[PDB]
């Protein structure tokens, strides 16, 4: 019956992520953010990527954990804001969800949406793999090239991460 | 004479330092602690089984605040108020009248089981051993009204057993 399920997961992703981006208190922001991260992991897992989405969900999660620790630490009100608490946040949430449902309407019941490109509005079973003989689940080797051919790239990556560590240490020390 | 503690030092022999390292690694005496606990595990436990196997007591235990009487005789109390005069929270209310013969008695002999503290001083003070601590300790009352004993409550409480109290005093009169 349903077929657009990747697009529908994208719609849920954009709803939660716009309510994220409308800036309420970071508690509710993180709630909508982890909802968005989980359904984005579902998008990329259902699209063909095996582990990369579950990986990035884990990483992004741990980032949001530390972000929650610091928003408990520093930014607290006498009573923090929710989506339905203040005028401006409520207006932004309604208007963002309005633009979302309007795009849903122009994709579903119309032909073409031309805001920045002439996006072909139909279902995303196209384009897709036409049953090619993988036998090794392409993205696994596609990440496994990083230690085979990836000489210079992980050198500068680890070097910049080491510099990131000492940078955080010296900015905290510089009192 | 004194015996102080932690005069000790890490001995610097190689077998000593490698045994301290192996204890640092494997948490060996932590496993010894586990073994001690398992040695109490296979030990048989020591509880009682309450409604069926009650716990022990002593012959000198302090219970009920009941009253005795003579062999087929009068109420043994003679209203001498020594029990109130030693009663530390004054939970002994005594109003006395002589009866219709000329012999002396009471009217009202109330013990406040709330305000009582179960010294035994009214056991030690009663000149004829008329007020006695009972053996049993089961009062457990759903109201506040029904922990204020009147005289007839006390005497019906003391007629629920005497052979009990006679046995405990008969086995305990020489001591005190």
């Amino acid at each position: 019956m349903m077929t657009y399920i990747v697009f529908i997961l994208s719609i849920i992703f954009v709803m939660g992520f716009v309510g994220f981006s409308s800036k309420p208190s970071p508690i509710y922001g993180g709630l909508g953010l982890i909802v968005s991260g989980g359904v984005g992991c579902g998008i990329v897992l259902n699209f063909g990527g095996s582990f990369l989405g579950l990986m990035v969900f884990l990483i992004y999660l741990g980032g949001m954990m530390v972000v929650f620790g610091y928003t408990t630490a520093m930014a607290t009100e006498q009573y923090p804001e929710v989506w339905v608490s203040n005028k401006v946040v409520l207006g932004t949430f309604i208007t963002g969800l309005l633009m979302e449902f309007l795009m849903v309407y122009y994709v579903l019941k119309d032909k073409e949406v031309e805001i920045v490109f002439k996006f072909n509005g139909m279902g995303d079973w196209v384009i897709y793999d036409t049953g090619d003989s993988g036998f090794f689940s392409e993205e696994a080797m596609g990440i496994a090239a990083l230690y085979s051919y990836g000489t210079w790239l992980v050198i500068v990556t680890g070097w910049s991460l080491l510099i990131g560590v000492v940078v955080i240490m010296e900015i905290t020390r510089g009192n | 004479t004194y015996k102080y503690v932690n005069l000790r030092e890490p001995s610097m022999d190689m077998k000593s330092v490698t045994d301290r390292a192996a204890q640092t690694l494997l948490w060996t005496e932590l496993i010894r602690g586990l073994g001690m606990t398992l040695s109490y595990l296979f030990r048989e436990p020591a509880t009682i089984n309450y409604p069926f196997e009650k716990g022990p007591l002593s012959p000198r235990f302090r219970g009920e605040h009941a009253l005795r009487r003579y062999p087929s005789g009068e109420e043994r109390c003679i209203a001498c108020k020594l029990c109130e005069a030693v009663c530390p929270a004054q939970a002994i209310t005594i109003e006395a009248e002589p009866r219709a013969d000329g012999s002396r008695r009471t009217t009202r002999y109330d013990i406040d089981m709330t305000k009582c503290i179960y010294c035994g001083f009214c056991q030690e003070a009663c000149p004829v051993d008329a007020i006695v601590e009972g053996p049993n300790f089961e009062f457990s009352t759903e109201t506040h009204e029904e922990l204020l004993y009147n005289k007839e409550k006390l005497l019906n409480n003391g007629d629920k057993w005497e052979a009990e109290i006679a046995a405990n005093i008969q086995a305990d009169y020489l001591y005190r």
Partner: protein, 156 residues
Amino acid sequence: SRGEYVVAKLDDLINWARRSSLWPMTFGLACCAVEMMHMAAPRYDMDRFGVVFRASPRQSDVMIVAGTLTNKMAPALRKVYDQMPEPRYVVSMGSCANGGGYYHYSYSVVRGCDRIVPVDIYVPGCPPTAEALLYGILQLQKKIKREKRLRIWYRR
């Protein structure tokens, strides 16, 4: 009479279920608290009866007021007692709590803890024994056998 029959069976079920666990909390002012700790002694187990310590005021069933309730304590006592779910029960444990007792004629001492909270079960003795306190909890379980709440609700 199938309606009252089925309601009677279900009321017996839930009343058995209420008298089953009954975990209290530990308020425990003075030496009656030491007697509570010896009711947690292994010679008289409470965990034969599913009766567990639970220091939060938010999931205990009965509450044992055990000690000498003073004026500096008593509003905090009721402000613990109230934020506790609708089946709530009080065990007045000890001569201090069941009517004032040994500190009755003094300032700063609440003369009996009926002046703050209601009381289901008084257990006198200073201290109670472990045996007498256990007898009081058994009588409270028999009160929970005597509920007939849901029969009352149906016959209303």
